[PDB]
Amino acid sequence: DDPNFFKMVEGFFDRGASIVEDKLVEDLKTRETEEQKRNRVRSILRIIKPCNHVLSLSFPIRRDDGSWEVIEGYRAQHSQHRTPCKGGIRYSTDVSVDEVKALASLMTYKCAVVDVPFGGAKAGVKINPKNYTDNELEKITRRFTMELAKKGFIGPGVDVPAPDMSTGEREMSWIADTYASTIGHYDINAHACVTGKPISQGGIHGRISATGRGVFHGIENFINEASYMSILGMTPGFGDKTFVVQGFGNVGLHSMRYLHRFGAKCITVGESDGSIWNPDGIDPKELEDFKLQHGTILGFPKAKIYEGSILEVDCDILIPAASEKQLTKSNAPRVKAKIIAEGANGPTTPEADKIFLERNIMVIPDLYLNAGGVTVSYFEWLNNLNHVSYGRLTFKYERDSNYHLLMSVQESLERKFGKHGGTIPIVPTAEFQDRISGASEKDIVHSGLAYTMERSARQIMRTAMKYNLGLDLRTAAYVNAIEKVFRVYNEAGVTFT
Amino acid sequence: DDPNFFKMVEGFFDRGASIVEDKLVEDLKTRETEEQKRNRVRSILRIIKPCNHVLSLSFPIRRDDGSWEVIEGYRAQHSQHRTPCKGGIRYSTDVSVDEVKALASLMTYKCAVVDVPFGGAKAGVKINPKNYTDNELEKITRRFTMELAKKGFIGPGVDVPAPDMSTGEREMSWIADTYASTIGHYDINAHACVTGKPISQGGIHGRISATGRGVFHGIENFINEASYMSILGMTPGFGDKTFVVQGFGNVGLHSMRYLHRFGAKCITVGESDGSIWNPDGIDPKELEDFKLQHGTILGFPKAKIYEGSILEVDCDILIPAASEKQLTKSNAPRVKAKIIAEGANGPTTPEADKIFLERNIMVIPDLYLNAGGVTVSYFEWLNNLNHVSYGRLTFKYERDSNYHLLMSVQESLERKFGKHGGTIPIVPTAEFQDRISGASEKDIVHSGLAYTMERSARQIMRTAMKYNLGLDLRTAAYVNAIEKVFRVYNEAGVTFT
Amino acid sequence: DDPNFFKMVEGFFDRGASIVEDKLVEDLKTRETEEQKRNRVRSILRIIKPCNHVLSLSFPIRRDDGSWEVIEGYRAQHSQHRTPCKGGIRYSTDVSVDEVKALASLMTYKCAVVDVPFGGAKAGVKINPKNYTDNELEKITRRFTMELAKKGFIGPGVDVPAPDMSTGEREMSWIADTYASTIGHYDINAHACVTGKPISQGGIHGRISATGRGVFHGIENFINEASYMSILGMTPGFGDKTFVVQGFGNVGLHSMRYLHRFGAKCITVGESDGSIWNPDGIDPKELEDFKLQHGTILGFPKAKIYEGSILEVDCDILIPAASEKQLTKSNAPRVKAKIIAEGANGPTTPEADKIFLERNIMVIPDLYLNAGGVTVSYFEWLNNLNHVSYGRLTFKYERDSNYHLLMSVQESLERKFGKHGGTIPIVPTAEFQDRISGASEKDIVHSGLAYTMERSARQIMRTAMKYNLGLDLRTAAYVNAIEKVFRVYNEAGVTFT
Numbered sequence A, B, C: 001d002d003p004n005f006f007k008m009v010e011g012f013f014d015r016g017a018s019i020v021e022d023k024l025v026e027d028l029k030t031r032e033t034e035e036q037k038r039n040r041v042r043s044i045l046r047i048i049k050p051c052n053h054v055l056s057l058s059f060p061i062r063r064d065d066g067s068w069e070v071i072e073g074y075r076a077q078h079s080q081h082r083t084p085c086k087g088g089i090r091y092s093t094d095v096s097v098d099e100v101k102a103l104a105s106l107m108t109y110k111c112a113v114v115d116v117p118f119g120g121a122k123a124g125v126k127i128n129p130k131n132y133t134d135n136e137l138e139k140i141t142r143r144f145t146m147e148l149a150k151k152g153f154i155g156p157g158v159d160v161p162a163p164d165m166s167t168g169e170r171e172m173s174w175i176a177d178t179y180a181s182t183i184g185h186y187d188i189n190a191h192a193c194v195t196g197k198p199i200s201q202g203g204i205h206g207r208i209s210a211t212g213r214g215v216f217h218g219i220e221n222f223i224n225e226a227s228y229m230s231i232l233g234m235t236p237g238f239g240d241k242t243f244v245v246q247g248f249g250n251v252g253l254h255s256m257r258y259l260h261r262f263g264a265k266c267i268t269v270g271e272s273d274g275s276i277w278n279p280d281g282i283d284p285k286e287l288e289d290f291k292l293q294h295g296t297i298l299g300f301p302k303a304k305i306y307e308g309s310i311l312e313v314d315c316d317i318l319i320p321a322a323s324e325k326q327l328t329k330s331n332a333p334r335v336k337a338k339i340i341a342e343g344a345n346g347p348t349t350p351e352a353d354k355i356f357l358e359r360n361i362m363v364i365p366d367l368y369l370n371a372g373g374v375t376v377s378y379f380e381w382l383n384n385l386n387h388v389s390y391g392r393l394t395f396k397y398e399r400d401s402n403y404h405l406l407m408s409v410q411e412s413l414e415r416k417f418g419k420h421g422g423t424i425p426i427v428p429t430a431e432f433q434d435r436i437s438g439a440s441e442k443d444i445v446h447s448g449l450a451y452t453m454e455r456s457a458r459q460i461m462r463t464a465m466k467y468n469l470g471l472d473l474r475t476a477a478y479v480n481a482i483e484k485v486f487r488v489y490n491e492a493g494v495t496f497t
């Protein structure tokens, strides 16, 4: 059980088309024959599936010891029905076009599941950042954008890179600075070419913790749904149950704190080295220190090394957040859990899905969970496309206008019950007192994220009941994804051909 | 014996580097240590070898029956040491990135062997032109350029497509018209984006027969070299020996006539269907009719069907001009020939080379033979970059000036020997009478091609003696190729890295 | 005597306008009043004089020890009557806008004196290349072009940098590579943005020795003019007289060999360290070795150190070729020479000119001598703007056509005097045998340079007699310069204002 990662995501898309194909002909309003309309649907589905562009590079670089190397680099743009196309830049010696093509596809559907205006994209670099000088990573990241930009694969109108595995705000700043100063110098939207930038360079409050909140608001939108918890046989709530984490990195890290702050007791955590198992809870603050002190989660003196993979650890909510294809046909029989959230991108093989549906354990699709990161990188790309600190124009104004609603209510009452002259004191609460001056930059993020992953969780529930998919929310997700991208191709007069 | 076609061309490049690496350190003038300089050479060689860009596409098209299809299309730009990058566009259901990457590499060396200012490139389309309407091929060719152009892979400053397998002047006109009218409208060099265009659209006299002349002037430059014919045991001349042809298409066709007009008796010819064997000669005119009348070289009533592949036919000069990897370890033992010219691109597997060197049969590298086609498509790209019919400015002027050289000589003599008054009539010959008005468009082609493949044949001879490569002219060719591309990287300060 | 270098060149321009102003009104064909026309001339002269653009920069760089620095950099575009604008890039800690503005002006007149289509320009960088790593010079040169390019000061349509003091073909390659790969990627004329590139990167045979030939053909065009040598009291010829050199660098070096190969005995040479005086001749080959071996012309065991400046050395032809303002009011009284050539740019202060005219010693203007370098960098900018090795198209053709002139003459004679049947053998000479195949790349250089500095030397002689300027050829040069740039402004309808 190790399919070509692109043949796998295609496999999910397949079961999606196998169910939509019927409810999609009846919504096609053209005037043709029944079979003809189906010969129209299946055709458009064959256009969605493949990637529309897969660039492939090679970089002469000069390492600090003067020697040269080549660096294969990739970038796919899955679909063009929606511009621009976002997608992270991954640094790993395990990246390939067969991987990038699929990760590129997912973000075409992630962005469709959470209603974000972007096509899919993804860029890889065969590289191990743990090997190279922090000068060499600059000469590599800047060259990698110099190559893309001149071939039309970076720019606020075509593609927007983003952080991903083994990349952070450090790299994303090198990109925005190279693009702004070479190609899009005159363009007013220069700095808006990448997301995940540092705050001082045009970022957004909580771009790092963005994905974590995703995993959080996702789990919350289901744990607090009794219709499934009655099936899974658990309790709506967090402090009553626990969870584990694969891949203590950005997702895994912030998936903890936001899920740790509400009573859910993070049992264990692991990484490429080993596992750290404590059935009583690990402080996400303290462990975060060792990643900056001891280089690994190992040695953590408030837990122990675990002779076994996290995926088999007894818990309540499994969260693979480290790499692809981790759960598989050989790990599925030994999960011993109830819910498998997904921070990583397609961490479950399609073979293991049936086993999970068979074992009666709910799998929440990665299309829905790690989509939080996108919906915040959208606010960033949209922040620095308007050139204004959101809400700055109307801080002093909203603060005044609200002080005149409450006043008018007061002045109005002091004429009806004011016969005694009694000063009715209409004053804000503690909560409203914060929201007087309006929506600050952080407020729309903590809301626009919690809202985007509210509508999405419904549209997934609303579908899985319409088609009776039970706990295969994944298939229900692709259905909502495919139905949306279809109406774009259908009405667009797909081509000039 | 069926290597990955890119692992094969790499294999030739390897044996090339294995011999140049020594004579190239001593020509490196930097001030370092011996071993260091070698750590500099091997590094640059690792930069040349791989392709710098390999795009990959997917086309929604609307066939005439209304159904949709996807069409994978590829384009590689091997190197950027020389802009623009030329390369044909092949239509075949057997094309892939693993093929295009190598064909792209060859033209980086072809252009280096014949001193033509272009990097290498190649574009493929998984398609069978024998299946589609001549309307659908337009909707495909125009879309294929629309996709490339917007991503910076067509344009007189980056890439210049050209005819290749299953494409002719018909297709190349659709490209130039689409590019000129969409992307490079304002650009003055719009129409110069492709070569192989029809004459009325900016072509060159004999762009079709260009490659054939290549195969001709190549063979001639060796047959008339006794130093090898003494080794091979044959006679310098054409009317005394024969030859066969694989792949009666453009190369194979015009390889015949230009080699048929000088006594060399074309024994047989074949194609995807079958062989046409006559040990007494086939009229290239008559057979050309059946390709336009009977759809195949079969049925040709002045010869017979041959129960066997051409590659084993007894002859004097074998010319594979149909596809890749035709000669191989299984066909090498049964060649029964003396010289194997190469119209096709890498039609010989590296394993068969040793057998050919062992059997003491000279193999002329495809780098040298089919390079004629490029050297004429260069004159085209250079014709329509100057916007003038070459030589038009000075037709009436040269005609006059020459009539004053010959006159002055006459008037000068009629004063020394003119004591008798005898009118010395200095008048042109028959030959010069043609070259009076200067160099017309066709004259520079028939010369610039015959000249370009004169210098090249020497530099190959001049190398194969300097390093004692005997009859492995192929290896001698790559040596001249690598030495040239190296001096470009070496001196360029290869990167800003 | 140390004027602001821009107030000095202005001073020469002044005496130029003071003489042209009369002979220029009568050539103005507009219909106005006499005084009005003069109010038109003086006005246009005030437009020529100043620089139209003087950029000024500042570079954050990261030295190899990690520390930051700023690097002031300048570039002036004197005039725009002729695009593009060429001008070297000088690296020296003595550069400033007050210097660049004037050097920029000179090349507007240099290019006008030798009829080369370029406005003037010049770029400086406050830097000492002897201090920085050969990595740091790359990070500086590439950044310096990145800054200019984005502000429209590099590009084959606006400006074309070139080598100058403390820069060579090494730097010019870093520029062409940075521009080609960032800004003008798509442009077909990308690599044509700079001149002085290495040959493998699009240079010209003898771009280094180009300026030297200038100094040579300049001196020759005057030494072989008796009209002045009768005044100066010397002999037309080189082997009969000697010369010295200031600044053994590129100009001074190649000024020697080309003037050494014709009997002229180079007495001494100096540099920032000291002088090397031998009244019997210094081998330019041997001394060139020590510059690559012993770091200085000092220690040269076939001469001695000279306790004195070159400018006072007894010789016949003084050539300052090291820096500006070297001759001055304090050095003029002690020249003890006959002719002062000028390789450097304005090495003579205007005060010293009168003393030189008074001492009756001819000063050849730098406008005329070092203009050879430009006229070759023009051929380069024009070479790589046509994308063809000049003369390659018609090597085999001219070789044939000439073999038919000589044949026709033979065949013609063998009918008049051929009654005896005697085979008249019309065959090329030794000299013509070289020029059969036509004009190669090096031939047009050695001619186009020797020709350009033939017409120029006449137009200067032709003027200095028309206005009776005696030996002040400098003033005669500016007259020809001003008269040319004037007709451009005059007829252009100078502005839309």
Ligand SMILES: NC(=O)C1=CN([C@@H]2O[C@H](COP(=O)(O)OP(=O)(O)OC[C@H]3O[C@@H](n4cnc5c(N)ncnc54)[C@H](O)[C@@H]3O)[C@@H](O)[C@H]2O)C=CC1
Residues within 6 Å of the ligand: A163, A164, A165, A166, A167, A211, A246, A247, A248, A249, A250, A251, A252, A270, A271, A272, A273, A321, A322, A323, A324, A343, A344, A345, A370, A373
């Ligand atoms: N971080 C983000 O912004 C987003 C991340 N994701 C997904 O989340 C996943 C992880 O988040 P990242 O930020 O990339 O984390 P990261 O870049 O910090 O690295 C993940 C960590 O997991 C560990 N790990 C990797 N492979 C492993 C394996 N096979 N077994 C055990 N441990 C392993 C590594 O030590 C690494 O520290 C990624 O796969 C990515 O697809 C998705 C969207 C946004």
Ligand SMILES: NC(=O)C1=CN([C@@H]2O[C@H](COP(=O)(O)OP(=O)(O)OC[C@H]3O[C@@H](n4cnc5c(N)ncnc54)[C@H](O)[C@@H]3O)[C@@H](O)[C@H]2O)C=CC1
Residues within 6 Å of the ligand: A191, A199, A200, A201, A202, A203, A383, A384, A385, A386, A387, A388, A389, A390, A441
């Ligand atoms: N290089 C570029 O073109 C960049 C442009 N921007 C744009 O600027 C806008 C800034 O808004 P926000 O940062 O959200 O407001 P903000 O109130 O969130 O500002 C964040 C930080 O930026 C600093 N800052 C504000 N103005 C500054 C200035 N003129 N110079 C230096 N630092 C300054 C503030 O001290 C604050 O600490 C964004 O909308 C973005 O579109 C932002 C970053 C880089």
Ligand SMILES: NC(=O)C1=CN([C@@H]2O[C@H](COP(=O)(O)OP(=O)(O)OC[C@H]3O[C@@H](n4cnc5c(N)ncnc54)[C@H](O)[C@@H]3O)[C@@H](O)[C@H]2O)C=CC1
Residues within 6 Å of the ligand: B163, B164, B165, B166, B167, B211, B246, B247, B248, B249, B250, B251, B252, B270, B271, B272, B273, B321, B322, B323, B324, B343, B344, B345, B370, B373
């Ligand atoms: N035609 C040109 O302008 C140039 C052609 N070439 C090379 O020359 C070769 C042929 O020239 P094209 O113009 O492409 O010919 P073409 O495009 O006319 O087609 C080649 C012919 O050979 C036959 N053929 C193909 N594969 C065969 C096989 N496996 N066995 C037997 N017959 C087969 C086909 O029937 C076809 O008619 C190509 O492989 C190409 O690489 C190289 C440079 C320029």
Ligand SMILES: NC(=O)C1=CN([C@@H]2O[C@H](COP(=O)(O)OP(=O)(O)OC[C@H]3O[C@@H](n4cnc5c(N)ncnc54)[C@H](O)[C@@H]3O)[C@@H](O)[C@H]2O)C=CC1
Residues within 6 Å of the ligand: B191, B199, B200, B201, B202, B203, B383, B384, B385, B386, B387, B388, B389, B390, B441
């Ligand atoms: N669409 C475009 O931008 C094109 C531009 N050109 C440029 O035009 C130049 C033409 O030179 P050549 O064709 O080599 O000269 P040529 O003497 O070879 O002309 C070839 C054919 O073009 C025809 N032709 C010439 N001028 C014409 C016009 N104004 N309208 C219609 N047909 C005309 C002539 O009748 C002749 O049959 C080329 O240098 C090329 O650069 C050529 C083709 C297309």
Ligand SMILES: NC(=O)C1=CN([C@@H]2O[C@H](COP(=O)(O)OP(=O)(O)OC[C@H]3O[C@@H](n4cnc5c(N)ncnc54)[C@H](O)[C@@H]3O)[C@@H](O)[C@H]2O)C=CC1
Residues within 6 Å of the ligand: C163, C164, C165, C166, C167, C211, C246, C247, C248, C249, C250, C251, C252, C270, C271, C272, C273, C321, C322, C323, C324, C343, C344, C345, C370, C373
């Ligand atoms: N080299 C060229 O391509 C061109 C040069 N020029 C002029 O020729 C002059 C020299 O040619 P470059 O190529 O710049 O030579 P360069 O760049 O090799 O350096 C000139 C040499 O003269 C010596 N020198 C500098 N200042 C001196 C001083 N005050 N006293 C004694 N020696 C000194 C230095 O040691 C240096 O090696 C320059 O001033 C420039 O204006 C003009 C046009 C083209």
Ligand SMILES: NC(=O)C1=CN([C@@H]2O[C@H](COP(=O)(O)OP(=O)(O)OC[C@H]3O[C@@H](n4cnc5c(N)ncnc54)[C@H](O)[C@@H]3O)[C@@H](O)[C@H]2O)C=CC1
Residues within 6 Å of the ligand: B081, B082, B083, B111, B112, B114, B115, B116, B117, B118, B119, B484, B485, B488, C191, C199, C200, C201, C202, C203, C383, C384, C385, C386, C387, C388, C389, C390, C441
């Ligand atoms: N990066 C760019 O865009 C460059 C473009 N060019 C253009 O190319 C033309 C070249 O003409 P010339 O060099 O004067 O001819 P040339 O006969 O003077 O060639 C000089 C050297 O270039 C080498 N060379 C020729 N073709 C080559 C190729 N395809 N690959 C690698 N090396 C090759 C030759 O071996 C020779 O040693 C120039 O007209 C120039 O416009 C030249 C240099 C760089």
Ligand SMILES: Nc1nc2c(ncn2[C@@H]2O[C@H](COP(=O)(O)OP(=O)(O)OP(=O)(O)O)[C@@H](O)[C@H]2O)c(=O)[nH]1
Residues within 6 Å of the ligand: A205, A206, A207, A208, A209, A210, A285, A442
């Ligand atoms: N690595 C790390 N990041 C943190 C930590 N605390 C907060 N952050 C991030 O830094 C941002 C600033 O935190 P706050 O000032 O508390 O604002 P906030 O959005 O209310 O913080 P949260 O509600 O915890 O998301 C937060 O949005 C988090 O994304 C922490 O302890 N460790």
Ligand SMILES: Nc1nc2c(ncn2[C@@H]2O[C@H](COP(=O)(O)OP(=O)(O)OP(=O)(O)O)[C@@H](O)[C@H]2O)c(=O)[nH]1
Residues within 6 Å of the ligand: B205, B206, B207, B208, B209, B210, B285, B442
């Ligand atoms: N298919 C085909 N093409 C031909 C034939 N004859 C000539 N051509 C091509 O058409 C062009 C015009 O031919 P010509 O008028 O004879 O000029 P040419 O260049 O002297 O012809 P060649 O010397 O045979 O190359 C030639 O350059 C050939 O490329 C032919 O019989 N069949």
Ligand SMILES: Nc1nc2c(ncn2[C@@H]2O[C@H](COP(=O)(O)OP(=O)(O)OP(=O)(O)O)[C@@H](O)[C@H]2O)c(=O)[nH]1
Residues within 6 Å of the ligand: C205, C206, C207, C208, C209, C210, C285, C442
């Ligand atoms: N530094 C240096 N350069 C040289 C020397 N000899 C020639 N060159 C340069 O290298 C080029 C190649 O020289 P040649 O092969 O002799 O061609 P060339 O143009 O006839 O040489 P010259 O007539 O001396 O200019 C010349 O154009 C010179 O510019 C030399 O001895 N030292």
